[PDB]
RNA sequence: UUCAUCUAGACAGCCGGACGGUGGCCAUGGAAGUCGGAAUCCGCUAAGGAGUGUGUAACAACUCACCGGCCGAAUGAACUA
RNA sequence: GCAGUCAAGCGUUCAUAGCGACAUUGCUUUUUGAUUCUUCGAUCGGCUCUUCCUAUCAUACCGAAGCAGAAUUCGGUAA
């Protein structure tokens, strides 16, 4: 697959009818942009969780 | 002058059709070609190779039944340089190439016919 | 316990440092797929995860 | 025959081995 | 800065225990024990061709 | 070249990036190698302009018929990509 | 196996004169003179006739025999150095920063001064050894030649040169700047 | 005066004809001549004049003289 | 960066002046240094060195076989 | 068993021949002596195998036996007593170096004219002056190195710069993949006794500008059983 | 200790040869002894692998395996203590 | 760990019994980095202050790494 030997020139993950991978790429870019705004740092943090909230949890 | 542009299955465009018209009907095979190059003129013609001549006489595979006389005609075709004394030895030289290709000469493996030659069961017209 | 912690620290450095071939961008995804064989990539990283 | 001495002893070695 | 060096003094307890270890291993080996080709006339001997003659 | 190579320049106080791609052959496309599929995916994905170099000349070891053939083969990728052709000199 | 006696021969050309008391060796020739102490070695010297000096070891082992051979080699090097001489050519290379190589005479001590190696302000000083002569080769870019009769001093000074300009904390596959020995030979 | 002046470092050598003085044994201060060499340490000596028997002897028992 | 840049760099400029001589000399001194590590490297490191050397001997024996 | 140099073993197909090959050559020359009429000695000190094969293909009826000098000396006879036929050590002593001992039944003059008219091109073969002189140009060096228009040739491969710099002692730099020098290096002058590295330089640049013509020294006829000496090149 | 090589010249060094069908067949953007898979033959030879490694995008070049020239007498491997 | 394979050697005065280094197979649960992460019966921890070991975390000097630089990983001397 990968390495100095690499007896792999062509894929098997190949779409025929060359316009089909264009239809795919546009769909994938739209899905990507959608996930970006769906799930949507600057040098500050949030304080530690108090140790009392873990009281039910104990060996 | 001379060059070799084997590359088959100045003015570098017209040489394409000059080469293809050296392989018009035959060959459809990766033969070796010699290009005698004058000023800008490509006098291109096939130089005989043993493997290509054998494969003419016959992923891809090979099983020939070359009939023991087409190999003799090939040996006559390229006893020119050949560095060998007799046709009876050039035939062995070509039968080795056939063994490497994987063909089946008459109906046996060509090493057995080399055995029959050097044992005294097969004759060669010298 | 120390021997366990060493191995899982090492493996976590592999898993988090390497990118998720899905979840990146389609262009980079397809490029790294044609380079590295996405199937082999994911299979190796799943082996390390398990 | 500085070499011939050695040559003779090699041959007698061979004779002994044969016997 | 050179480091320590082990000592060679034998501290009697050790040599008693070793004697006992060996006296036990000898019995164990004797218990497990319950479960020629003459090399010839070697070369470099100059007069080796004469030993072949006292046979008959 | 067996890979994509990148360069940058500044035009009109704006960073641009040019991408050289190794090569494409005419290749009926249900068999092609991982070097040409790089070029194909790059042309398909990115929001660029695209400059096809023709080299109108006997040089190149490639004929003008084959060049225009490749162009007509890969023009479906060009449907939204701002194409230009450049001749590099019957 | 305590070889009863082992010998090595040393050939002396006509112009050379060799003087050997206990194990000190003086060799005089056209290019100059050379001296060497070999009292650490415990061998024996002797002369045959003005062109052949023999060194011998009696009842010795492998290390003693090796010492005999290397003694022979050292004396042969002395003779070659006083007759022909030793000449080492070095070339200094750079990619971006031109290395400036000069000589300075500081308290009459003959230091070699290297500046701007890989873009540093440090000035690398290499003391020249006695019996060594530096010259900057003309009509050859960035080459320096060290000539003398002592192969030891010449080679050690060249080694000091190529060691003082070593690259530090950088991939040497990429960074090729340095001073390297191009050629060894005679005058 | 431009010839090589290598030293000699003379030595009393163990050789047939080398005469030796026996410093310890029954002879104890008699002369004998080395007639054969057995190894680095042993030789065969013979003094009939002073009356020592022909024998094998270590070299530590004798001391070589410069005479031969 | 951007591709096999050091391979390009070696093709264009080339490795050093003192590269092949030093590599030859390392390969030559390795014979001395292998034995040096054997008579040195007290403890676990010497044990592991011996293990590796034995395995390497067996591999070459099997290869020649 | 230690403090020795280890022999670098490698695993190839071919294997050494031994005494059987030499005995075979011995029997071959001795049975060909009885067969053919004339026997010749040819000094072939530095040859190409295609040239030797051309010489062999020139006649399939005649024989040519190469091999070891001391083996052919023994087959013929070096002493006047130890000999196969009469007046034969007189011939056997002529063999100098690489000797190709030929057998034939053909006329003397055909052989004599063939082996003086036969001449080929070859390298200059050090310890032999060359009839050529080469200053390399002071720019970029090409694969032929000053023998043809550079517009035909390509620059040599960058991998040869360590070789040229160290083994051939050429002062060499490289700017990008091309090899480069500052001044025109002269390698040789006509009538200059060549050395090893000069020969290797000319070989690397591909210069076969030396006249290979085989030398023949002697000749022996079985029916007459006489020697005859003719230095012909 | 055992087995081998050697004046029909051993071991080490230098030098030269190291070929021809043939750029052997599959494969590939390209692979010609040396990314890989599988054959692994014959010829001419003193000897020369459908090739031991470096290397090239591919060739090239170098190298060893093997042979020969010069050198002139001992040498190598595996084991035991 | 258990059960095996192979074979460098050892080998009742065994060729076809036995032993057996280095390698190596199966079982441990899965193949697509979704694992929600999930604990299951032990008959000590914290002050002052001193020293020692190195099996070195950092600092010092080096080696090898596709080590461009920057940062980092492995390792050598070093308490």
Spatial neighbors of G81 by CB under 8 A, at least 6 apart, are: G31, G34, G148, G149, G150, G151
Has residue H2 been placed in a domain? no
Choose from C37, C38, C45 for mutation: most chain A CBs within 10 A. C37
* Locus of tokens 């389609």: C26
Q: Which residues of F line the annotated binding site?
A: 20-24, 88-89
> Cβ(B27)–Cβ(B57) under 8 Å?
no
Cα angle, residue C39 at apex, residues C35 and C44 outer, rounded to 5°:
100
Residue of D nearest to E44 (CA): D13
**β-pairing verdict for F50-53 and J63-65:** unpaired
- Distance from the first to the final alpha carbon of chain G: 43
Largest interatomic CA distance in chain E: 78
Place of tokens 């560095």: B83
Q: Which of J192, J222, J178, J204 is nearest to J85 (CA)?
A: J222
What resolution in Å is listed for this PDB structure? Answer: 3.1
Name the neighbours of J, counting chains with at least 3 Cβ pairs within 8 A.
Answer: B, G, I
Contact in structure between G10 and G53 (CB atoms under 8 Å): yes
Domain annotation covers residue H29: yes
Helix (H, G, I), strand (E, B) or coil at B70: helix
Interatomic distance A49 CA / L38 C1' (Å): 20
Assess contact for G93 and G176: CB atoms under 8 A: yes
Region label for E37, one of left (φ > 0), alpha (ψ between -120 and 50) or beta (otherwise): beta
Cα(I6)–Cα(G172) distance, rounded to whole angstroms? 11
Q: Which residue of E has its CA nearest to D17?
A: E49
- The parent domain of residue H31 ranges over 13-68
G48 CB burial (10 A radius; 0-12, 13-18, 19+):
exposed
Distance from residue A14's CA to nucleotide K59's C1', rounded to whole Å: 34
CB contact under 8 A, G172 and I16: yes
Triad C35, C39, C45: Cα angle to 5°: 100
CA distance F24 to F78: 15
In F, which residues are within 8 Å of I2 by CB distance? 5-6
B108: which strand partners? B105
Q: Calculate the angstrom distance between C1' of K58 and CA of A58.
A: 69
- Is I6 at the interface with chain G, CB within 8 A? yes
Question: Is residue H41, in this structure, part of any structural domain at all?
Answer: yes
Pairing of strands H42-47, G17-20: unpaired
Q: How far apart are CA D4 and CA G168, in angstroms?
A: 65
H19 to chain G nearest CA, in Å?
Answer: 21
Contact H31, H46 (CB under 8 A): no
Q: Which residue has the tokens 């004058």?
A: B38
Please identify residues in chain F, positions 33-62, with a C-beta within 7 angstroms of any atom of strand K. 33, 35
Helix axes J69-76, J19-35, angle to 10 degrees: 40
Tokens of B90: 């050039």
Residue H1 falls within a domain, yes or no?
no
Tell me if chain I has a CB within 8 Å of the CB of G155: no
The CATH superfamily label for domain G86-187 reads Ribosomal protein L6 (3.90.930.12)
CA J100 / C1′ K9 distance in Å: 19
CA distance J94 to J80: 14
Chain L: bases < 7 Å from a protein Cβ: 8, 13, 21-23, 30-35, 39-40, 53-54, 62, 66-70, 76, 78-79
Is the link from the previous residue into G143 a cis peptide, with omega within 30 of 0?
no
Give the C-alpha separation, F30 to I44, whole Å.
Answer: 58
DSSP class of residue A21 equals H
- Selected residue of B85, B88, B89 to mutate for chain J interface (largest J Cβ count, 10 A): B85
CA-to-CA distance for C49 and C38, rounded, in angstroms? Answer: 16
Q: Within an 8 Å CB–CB cutoff, is residue I31 touching chain J?
A: yes
Residues 103-132 (J) near nucleic chain K, CB < 7 A: 123, 125-126
Give the DSSP letter of residue G46.
E
* Both structure tokens of E51: 């030993």
Nucleotide nearest to C40 (CA to C1'): L32
Q: Return d(Cα B86, Cα J60) in angstroms, integer.
A: 9
Confirm whether any atom of chain L, the nucleic acid strand, is less than 7 Å from CB of G95: no
G88 forms bridges with which residues in the sheet?
Answer: G146, G184
> How far apart are the C-alpha atoms of E1 and H65, rounded to whole Å?
55
Whether C20 sits with its Cβ under 7 A from any strand L atom: the answer reads yes
| Closest listed residue to residue G50, CA positions, set A34, H1, E50 | H1
Q: Looking at chain A from residue 1 to 59, which residues have their Cβ under 8 Å from any Cβ of chain C?
A: 1-2, 8, 11, 13, 25, 28-29, 32
Within a domain: H4 = no
Is the CB atom of residue G169 positioned under 7 angstroms from any atom of strand L? Answer: yes
For residue G103, the cross-strand partners are G112
> Helix-strand-coil percent breakdown of chain B, rounded to 5?
40, 15, 50
List of chain I residues whose C-beta atoms are within 8 Å of the C-beta of residue J158: 11-12, 14
Which residues of chain G does CATH 3.90.930.12 include? 1-85, 86-187
Contact C35, A15 (CB under 8 A): no
Beta bridge partners of G135: G145
Beta-sheet pairing, G52-57 with G6-11: antiparallel
- Give the residues across from B56 on adjacent strands: none
Nearest to A29 among C26, C35, C37 (CB): C26
* Spatial separation of the C-alpha atoms in residues G7 and G23, rounded to whole Å: 16
Q: So what's the architecture of G1-85 in CATH?
A: Alpha-Beta Complex (3.90)
- Residue J73 contacts residue J89 (beta carbons within 8 Å): no
In whole angstroms, give the CA distance from residue G123 to residue G142. Answer: 18
Which 1-60 residues of chain I approach strand L with CB closer than 7 Å?
A: 1, 4-7, 45, 51, 54-55, 58
Residue F6 with chain I: CB contacts under 8 Å: 2
Q: Residues of F at the annotated binding site for GTP?
A: 20-24, 88-89
Contact criterion met (CB below 8 Å) for F49 and F82: yes
| Cis peptide bond upstream of B27, omega within 30 | yes
CA–CA separation, J99 vs J72, rounded Å?
9
I64 at the J interface (CB within 8 A)? yes
Q: For residues G45 and G40, what is the distance between their CA atoms, to the nearest angstrom?
A: 14
By DSSP bridging, strand F50-53 and strand F83-86 are parallel
The CA–CA distances, whole Å, from A14 to A18, J3, J143 equal 10, 62, 44
Which chain G residues touch J183 with a CB distance below 8 Å?
A: 139
Which residues of chain B are within 8 Å of residue J148 when distances are taken between CB atoms? Answer: none
Q: Which of B 103-122 have CB under 7 A of nucleic chain K?
A: 111, 114, 118
Are the beta carbons of E21 and E14 closer than 8 angstroms?
no
Match 């070659």 to its residue by tokens: G80
SS3 F29: coil
Give, as ranges, the nucleotides of chain K with any atom within 7 Å of a protein CB. 1-3, 5-9, 12, 14-30, 35-36, 38-52, 55-62, 64-70, 73-74, 76-77, 79-81
Looking at the 3D structure of chain H, how many domains does it have?
1
Helix (H), strand (E), coil (C) string for J160-220: HHHHHHHHCCCCCEEECCEEECCCCCEEECCCCCCCHHHHHHHHHHCCCCEEECCEEEEEE
CATH number, domain at H50?
2.30.30.30
């Amino acid at each position: 697959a990968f390495g100095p030997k690499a007896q792999r020139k062509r894929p098997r993950l190949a779409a025929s009818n060359l316009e089909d991978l264009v239809k795919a790429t546009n769909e994938d870019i739209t899905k990507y942009e959608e996930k970006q705004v769906l799930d949507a740092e600057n040098g500050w943090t949030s304080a530690a969780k108090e140790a009392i909230f873990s009281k039910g949890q104990s060996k | 002058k001379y060059l070799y542009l084997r590359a088959v299955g100045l003015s570098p465009k017209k040489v394409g059709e000059d080469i293809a018209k050296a392989t018009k009907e035959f060959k459809g095979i990766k033969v070796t070609v010699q290009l005698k190059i004058q000023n800008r003129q490509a006098a291109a013609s096939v130089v005989p190779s043993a493997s290509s001549l054998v494969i003419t006489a016959l992923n891809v595979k090979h099983s020939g039944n070359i009939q023991l006389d087409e190999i003799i005609e090939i040996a006559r075709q390229m006893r020119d340089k050949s560095f060998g004394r007799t046709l009876a030895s050039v035939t062995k030289e070509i039968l080795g190439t056939a063994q490497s290709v994987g063909c089946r000469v008459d109906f046996k493996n060509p090493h057995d016919i080399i055995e029959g030659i050097n044992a005294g069961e097969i004759e060669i017209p010298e | 316990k120390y021997t366990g912690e060493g191995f899982v620290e090492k493996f976590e450095d592999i898993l988090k440092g390497f990118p998720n071939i899905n979840d990146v961008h389609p262009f980079h995804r397809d490029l790294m797929d044609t380079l590295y064989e996405k199937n082999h990539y994911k299979i190796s990283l799943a082996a390390i995860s398990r | 025959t500085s070499w011939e001495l050695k040559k003779q002893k090699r041959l007698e070695d061979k004779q002994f081995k044969e016997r | 800065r050179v480091r320590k060096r082990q000592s060679r003094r034998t501290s009697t307890k050790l040599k008693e225990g070793i004697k006992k270890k060996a006296s036990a291993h000898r019995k164990k080996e004797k218990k497990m024990a319950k479960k020629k080709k003459d090399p010839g006339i070697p070369s470099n001997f100059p007069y080796k061709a004469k030993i072949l003659e006292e046979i008959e | 070249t067996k890979s994509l190579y990148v360069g940058h320049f500044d035009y009109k106080y704006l960073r641009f990036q040019a991408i050289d791609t190794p090569g494409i052959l005419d290749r009926p496309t249900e068999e092609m190698n991982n070097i040409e599929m790089q070029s194909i995916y790059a042309i398909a994905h990115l929001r660029s302009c695209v400059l096809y170099f023709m080299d109108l000349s006997e040089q190149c070891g490639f004929t003008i018929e084959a060049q225009v053939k490749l162009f007509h083969s890969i023009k479906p990728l060009f449907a939204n990509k701002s194409v230009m052709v450049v001749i590099n000199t019957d | 196996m305590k070889y009863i006696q082992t010998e090595q021969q040393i050939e002396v050309p006509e112009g050379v004169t060799v003087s050997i008391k206990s194990r000190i060796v003086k060799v005089v020739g056209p290019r100059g003179t050379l001296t060497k102490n070999l009292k650490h070695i415990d061998v024996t010297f002797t002369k045959v006739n003005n062109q052949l000096i023999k060194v011998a070891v009696h009842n010795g082992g492998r290390k003693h025999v090796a010492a005999l051979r290397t003694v022979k080699s050292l004396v042969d090097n002395m003779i070659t150095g006083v007759t022909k001489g030793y000449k080492y050519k070095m070339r200094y290379v750079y990619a971006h920063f031109p290395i400036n190589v000069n000589i300075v005479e500081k308290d009459g001590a003959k230091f070699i001064e290297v500046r701007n190696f890989l873009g540093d302000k440090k000035i690398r000083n290499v003391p020249v050894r006695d019996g060594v002569t530096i010259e900057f080769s003309t009509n050859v870019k960035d080459e320096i030649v060290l000539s003398g009769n002592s192969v030891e001093d010449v080679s050690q000074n060249a080694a000091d040169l190529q060691q003082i300009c070593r690259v530090r904390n950088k991939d040497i596959r990429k960074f090729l700047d340095g001073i390297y020995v191009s050629h060894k030979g005679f005058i | 005066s431009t010839d090589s002046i290598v030293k000699a470092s003379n030595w009393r050598l163990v050789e047939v004809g080398r005469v030796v003085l026996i410093k310890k044994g029954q002879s104890a201060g008699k002369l004998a001549a080395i007639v054969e060499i057995i190894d680095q340490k042993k030789v065969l000596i013979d003094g009939p004049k002073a009356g020592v028997p022909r024998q094998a002897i270590n070299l530590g028992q004798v001391v070589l003289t410069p005479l031969t | 960066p951007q591709n096999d840049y050091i391979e390009r760099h070696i093709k264009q400029h080339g490795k050093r002046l003192d590269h092949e001589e030093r590599k030859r000399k390392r390969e030559a001194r390795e014979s001395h240094k292998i034995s040096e590590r054997a008579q040195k490297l007290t403890g676990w490191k010497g044990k592991q060195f011996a293990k590796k050397r034995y395995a390497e001997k067996v591999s070459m024996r099997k290869k020649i076989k | 068993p230690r403090s020795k140099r280890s022999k670098l073993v490698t695993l190839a197909q071919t294997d050494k021949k031994g005494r059987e090959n030499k005995e075979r050559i011995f029997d071959e020359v001795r049975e060909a002596l009885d067969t053919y009429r004339y026997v010749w000695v040819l000094h072939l000190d530095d040859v190409r195998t295609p040239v030797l094969q051309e010489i062999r293909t020139s006649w399939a009826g005649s024989k040519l036996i190469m091999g070891k000098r001391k083996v052919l000396q023994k087959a013929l006879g070096e002493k006047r007593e130890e000999e196969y036929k009469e007046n034969l050590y007189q011939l056997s002593k002529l063999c100098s170096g690489v000797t190709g001992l030929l057998f034939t039944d053909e006329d003397v003059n055909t052989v004599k004219e063939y082996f003086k008219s036969y001449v080929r091109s070859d390298y200059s073969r050090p310890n032999t002056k060359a009839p050529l002189t080469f200053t390399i140009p002071e720019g970029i060096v090409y694969s032929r190195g000053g023998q043809i228009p550079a517009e035909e040739d390509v620059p040599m491969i960058h991998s040869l710069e360590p070789t040229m710099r160290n083994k051939f002692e050429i002062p060499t730099k490289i700017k990008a993949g091309k090899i480069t020098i500052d001044s025109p290096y002269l390698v040789c002058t006509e009538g200059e006794k060549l050395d090893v590295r000069q020969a290797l330089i000319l070989k690397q640049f591909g210069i076969a500008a030396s006249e290979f013509k085989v030398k023949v020294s002697a000749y022996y006829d079985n029916d007459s059983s006489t020697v005859e000496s003719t230095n012909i090149n």
